[PDB]
Symmetry: C3
Subunit: 27 residues, 3 copies
């Protein structure tokens, strides 16, 4: 329940860093 | 405090899946 | 461990609101 969200927040976190990166190129 | 972040991580999580999707079309 | 993810979920959360915003202009 805490670990679950733990590693989870670790993936949306990466996923997001990516989005910021690729979209930023798109501009 | 844990539930709060719980359903919260459930929305940024979806929101993100969307962004990945729409932006990916943008490329 | 809970606080850590706490403020963390607070940043991906903002970061994401931004992405939704800027990408949405991109369309």
């Amino acid at each position: 329940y805490v670990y679950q969200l733990k590693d989870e927040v670790g993936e949306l976190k990466g996923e997001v860093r990516a989005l910021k990166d690729e979209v930023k190129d798109l501009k």
